[model samples]
Target: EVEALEKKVEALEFKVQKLEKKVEALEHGWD
Candidate 1:
Protein backbone atom coordinates (compact mmCIF):
# COMPACT_ATOMS: atom_id res chain seq x y z
CA GLU A 1 0.00 0.00 0.00
CA VAL A 2 2.77 2.41 0.87
CA GLU A 3 4.62 1.56 -2.34
CA ALA A 4 1.51 2.16 -4.42
CA LEU A 5 0.94 5.52 -2.75
CA GLU A 6 4.51 6.51 -3.45
CA LYS A 7 4.03 5.64 -7.12
CA LYS A 8 0.95 7.82 -7.27
CA VAL A 9 2.81 10.68 -5.67
CA GLU A 10 5.63 10.36 -8.17
CA ALA A 11 3.20 10.45 -11.06
CA LEU A 12 1.60 13.60 -9.70
CA GLU A 13 5.04 15.15 -9.24
CA PHE A 14 5.92 14.46 -12.85
CA LYS A 15 2.66 15.98 -14.03
CA VAL A 16 3.32 19.09 -11.99
CA GLN A 17 6.77 19.37 -13.53
CA LYS A 18 5.41 19.13 -17.05
CA LEU A 19 2.81 21.78 -16.32
CA GLU A 20 5.44 24.04 -14.80
CA LYS A 21 7.60 23.69 -17.88
CA LYS A 22 4.74 24.64 -20.15
CA VAL A 23 3.86 27.62 -18.00
CA GLU A 24 7.48 28.74 -17.93
CA ALA A 25 7.75 28.51 -21.68
CA LEU A 26 4.65 30.60 -22.17
CA GLU A 27 5.78 33.09 -19.59
CA HIS A 28 8.99 33.59 -21.59
CA GLY A 29 6.96 34.17 -24.82
CA TRP A 30 8.17 31.00 -26.51
CA ASP A 31 4.74 29.49 -26.69
Candidate 2:
Protein backbone atom coordinates (compact mmCIF):
# COMPACT_ATOMS: atom_id res chain seq x y z
CA GLU A 1 0.00 0.00 0.00
CA VAL A 2 2.85 2.38 0.79
CA GLU A 3 4.48 1.75 -2.57
CA ALA A 4 1.26 2.36 -4.40
CA LEU A 5 0.71 5.57 -2.50
CA GLU A 6 4.19 6.76 -3.37
CA LYS A 7 3.61 6.11 -7.04
CA LYS A 8 0.36 8.02 -6.94
CA VAL A 9 2.05 10.97 -5.29
CA GLU A 10 4.81 10.96 -7.88
CA ALA A 11 2.35 10.89 -10.73
CA LEU A 12 0.40 13.80 -9.25
CA GLU A 13 3.57 15.84 -8.83
CA PHE A 14 4.55 15.21 -12.43
CA LYS A 15 1.17 16.34 -13.68
CA VAL A 16 1.23 19.45 -11.49
CA GLN A 17 4.64 20.39 -12.85
CA LYS A 18 3.47 19.94 -16.40
CA LEU A 19 0.38 22.06 -15.76
CA GLU A 20 2.46 24.82 -14.19
CA LYS A 21 4.72 24.93 -17.20
CA LYS A 22 1.73 25.04 -19.52
CA VAL A 23 0.19 27.94 -17.64
CA GLU A 24 3.46 29.84 -17.69
CA ALA A 25 3.77 29.40 -21.43
CA LEU A 26 0.24 30.66 -22.00
CA GLU A 27 0.79 33.71 -19.84
CA HIS A 28 4.02 34.58 -21.58
CA GLY A 29 2.46 34.12 -25.00
CA TRP A 30 -0.33 36.52 -24.09
CA ASP A 31 2.20 39.18 -23.07
Candidate 3:
Protein backbone atom coordinates (compact mmCIF):
# COMPACT_ATOMS: atom_id res chain seq x y z
CA GLU A 1 0.00 0.00 0.00
CA VAL A 2 2.82 2.42 0.69
CA GLU A 3 4.35 1.75 -2.68
CA ALA A 4 1.06 2.32 -4.41
CA LEU A 5 0.53 5.55 -2.56
CA GLU A 6 3.99 6.75 -3.52
CA LYS A 7 3.27 6.01 -7.17
CA LYS A 8 0.04 7.92 -6.98
CA VAL A 9 1.75 10.90 -5.43
CA GLU A 10 4.43 10.86 -8.08
CA ALA A 11 1.86 10.74 -10.82
CA LEU A 12 -0.01 13.67 -9.36
CA GLU A 13 3.21 15.68 -9.04
CA PHE A 14 4.12 14.99 -12.64
CA LYS A 15 0.68 16.01 -13.83
CA VAL A 16 0.82 19.24 -11.89
CA GLN A 17 4.24 20.05 -13.33
CA LYS A 18 2.96 19.48 -16.84
CA LEU A 19 -0.06 21.65 -16.22
CA GLU A 20 2.13 24.43 -14.80
CA LYS A 21 4.39 24.34 -17.82
CA LYS A 22 1.41 24.43 -20.15
CA VAL A 23 -0.07 27.40 -18.39
CA GLU A 24 3.23 29.22 -18.43
CA ALA A 25 3.61 28.69 -22.15
CA LEU A 26 0.12 29.95 -22.86
CA GLU A 27 0.62 33.00 -20.71
CA HIS A 28 3.87 33.91 -22.44
CA GLY A 29 2.27 33.38 -25.83
CA TRP A 30 -0.52 35.79 -24.98
CA ASP A 31 1.98 38.41 -23.85
How do all models score by TM-score? 0.74, 0.75, 0.71
Off by over 4 Å in 3: none
List pairs with backbone clashes in candidate 3.
Answer: none
Give per-residue CA lDDT, model 3, range 1-31, as digits (tens). 9999999999999999999999998989955
Ranking by TM-score: 2, 1, 3
Better of 1 and 2 by lDDT: 1
Model 3 residue 24 CA deviation in Å: 0.2
C-alpha positional error of residue 20 in candidate 3 after TM-score superposition, expressed in Å: 0.6
lDDT of 1: 0.96
Our model 1 lands, by Cα RMSD against the true structure, at 1.1
Which one wins on lDDT? 1
Clashing pairs in 2: none
